[PDB]
């Protein structure tokens, strides 16, 4: 046992979730593409709700935005523009092409790495400013992230917004989700407890300055 209080849950299948929003089928046409959303389903692995997205000859399970419904049209692109883009709720665009007050989700860290941050249900970051070809966003933990402007991000808030307001009726529901009860040992609080007022940590930057 390395992590306590995990086990005895319901049987769950895992859905293969594609994190890279811009993934062309073939390298013959590297242009922006447009796909169609078929259905939005519940996923037991994460708090979010996923959507099946089909285009070309393949389907991917992606993380759904707030109002993605059955039979929708979603545009994925890498094209950065000086007239920017008019952002809808489905589109995936690089951070350099988005307007200043844009709410975003599934934020890519390194260009080509894939989406890592802002994945939980109802959580959305916000773009702050774009200076010297570099994007700065604000995370759901209110921390500033400095990223290259060519990283692809999806505009909007993750679906199932009322996941925070979801009430658990009993301990049986916790055992259904798989959370074992806490230990009965009474531990006196140390100095770590208490209301710690700390200043905000500085901006975390992944742009490598030569």
């Amino acid at each position: 046992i390395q992590v306590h209080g995990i086990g005895g849950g319901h049987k769950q299948r895992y859905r293969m979730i594609d994190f890279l929003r811009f993934r062309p089928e073939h390298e013959s046409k590297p242009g922006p593409f447009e796909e169609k959303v078929i259905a939005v389903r519940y996923d037991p692995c994460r708090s979010a709700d996923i959507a099946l997205v089909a285009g070309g000859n393949r389907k991917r399970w992606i993380i759904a935005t707030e109002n993605m419904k059955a039979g929708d049209t979603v545009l994925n692109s890498d094209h950065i523009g000086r007239m920017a883009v008019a952002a809808r709720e489905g589109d995936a665009h690089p951070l350099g092409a988005l307007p200043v007050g844009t709410l975003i989700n599934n934020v890519e860290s390194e260009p080509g790495r894939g989406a890592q941050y802002i994945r939980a249900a109802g959580t959305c970051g916000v773009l702050l400013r774009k200076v010297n070809g570099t994007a700065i966003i604000q995370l759901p933990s209110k921390r500033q992230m400095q990223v290259l402007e060519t990283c692809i991000a999806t505009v909007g808030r993750v679906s199932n917004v009322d996941h925070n307001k979801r009430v658990i009726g009993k301990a049986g529901r916790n055992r259904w989700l798989g959370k074992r009860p806490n230990s009965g040992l009474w531990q006196r609080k140390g100095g770590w407890a208490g209301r710690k007022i700390r200043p905000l940590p500085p901006m975390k930057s992944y742009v490598k300055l030569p």
Binding site: R23, F33, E34, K36, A54, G55, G56, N57, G112, R113
Partner: protein
């Protein structure tokens, strides 16, 4: 990107070579002479193994390009278990027909005629429903792979009993698990339907054309529905090995040359194993077109042209409770162009033959509220099935 392999679950890389092998002009001393492992000696490097006489079972699998029928053009093959997403839309697109909601007026006239019915129609069909769902098995709850071919074969026996009044049903025969191949080109990509069917009805005589020339001419200016983000390829299987030869399951000189009805069975317990109804319709469209194209190229030749004599193939898709009916008329071979004459397809969708069945009597508050047997009955489904069987005569 996020690669889907795991470093632990993947096969390990080979251990790094001993530093003796990096010395030029030095013979390594290994444990290969004693034919077992020994600590302190270098690991020997053996050449790849060459079994001079070949064994069939224990050899490595030959590559796909080694096969004689391998071709560079990737053909898209449809078999029994392939699923189509926009099933009716993909079926209409890859088949180049036009969808019609009702069955033909000849079929409705054949069904609604009171002289074409059996002696006690409702009694025999309700007894067939009860026989398939409850009576035919020792168990109290028979499974769907048991009761679906039973209800199909029972309906075939019920419409086969009409041969004494109509002595033209003896020109037919049933066939099983045949090899079907039909390859064509549809807008710069190569399609092929290939596989088998459940049960296929053939006859000596062809089926007469069912659509009027006014319908054929009004089909000409019909535009096919298009769908942008999904390609019409999607759902088929990419294959680099195939043969460009239309292969029906029957060889030359067969006494029963023209198929009259296909029968499609969904025999599975679980919901994800069975087809969705749109996928089932798509499967009957493309298989019935495969049989019709096999007919219209065997009787005419490899040249692509419009048909002065249409080819009519019918099919019934069965879940065991809910039926789908198809009459497909083939008129056109040259599917490379999108502007020519389109073929026709009449589809009755989701004909419910019964609502629900109770195998055991349900008891609420110590009394029987619903008796044993099927709840709800629609004889129009049987009437359409009987018309589809009796369409030859």
């Amino acid at each position: 990107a996020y690669e889907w392999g795991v470093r632990s679950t993947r096969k390990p890389e080979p251990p790094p070579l001993d530093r003796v092998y990096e010395i030029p002009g030095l013979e390594p001393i290994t444990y290969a002479g004693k034919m077992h492992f020994m600590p302190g000696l270098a690991r020997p490097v053996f050449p790849p193994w060459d079994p001079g006489w070949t064994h069939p079972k224990f050899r490595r699998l030959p590559p796909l390009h080694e096969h004689p029928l391998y071709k560079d053009q990737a053909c898209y093959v449809f078999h029994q278990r392939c699923r189509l997403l926009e099933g009716v839309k993909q079926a209409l697109w890859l088949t180049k027909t036009q969808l019609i909601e009702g069955l033909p007026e000849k079929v409705l006239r054949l069904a609604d005629d009171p002289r074409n019915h059996i002696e006690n129609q409702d009694e025999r069909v309700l007894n067939a429903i009860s026989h398939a769902r409850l009576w035919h098995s020792t168990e109290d709850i028979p499974k769907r792979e048991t009761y679906c071919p039973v209800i199909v074969d029972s309906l075939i026996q019920l419409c086969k009993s009409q041969i004494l009044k109509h002595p033209s049903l003896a020109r037919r025969i049933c066939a099983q698990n045949n090899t079907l191949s039909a390859t064509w080109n549809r807008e710069s990509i190569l399609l092929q339907v290939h596989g088998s069917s459940g049960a296929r009805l053939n006859a000596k005589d062809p089926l007469p054309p069912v659509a009027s020339q006014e319908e054929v001419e009004a089909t000409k200016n019909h535009v096919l529905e298009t769908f942008y983000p999904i390609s019409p390829t999607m759902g088929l299987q990419e294959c680099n090995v195939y043969d460009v030869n239309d292969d029906t399951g029957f060889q030359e000189g067969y006494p029963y040359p023209c198929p009259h009805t296909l029968y499609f069975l969904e025999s599975a317990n679980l919901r994800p194993r069975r087809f969705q109804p749109d996928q089932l319709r798509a499967k009957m469209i493309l298989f019935a077109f495969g049989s019709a194209l096999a007919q219209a190229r065997l009787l005419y030749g490899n040249d692509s042209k419009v048909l002065e004599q249409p080819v009519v193939v019918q099919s019934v898709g069965t879940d065991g409770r809910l039926f789908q009916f198809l009459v497909l008329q083939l008129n056109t071979t040259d599917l490379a162009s999108d502007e020519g004459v389109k073929n026709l397809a009449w589809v009755d969708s989701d004909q419910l033959l019964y609502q629900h069945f109770w195998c055991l009597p349900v008891i609420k508050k110590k009394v029987v509220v619903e008796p044993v047997g099927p709840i709800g009955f629609q004889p129009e489904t049987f009437r359409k099935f009987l018309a589809l069987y009796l369409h030859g005569a």
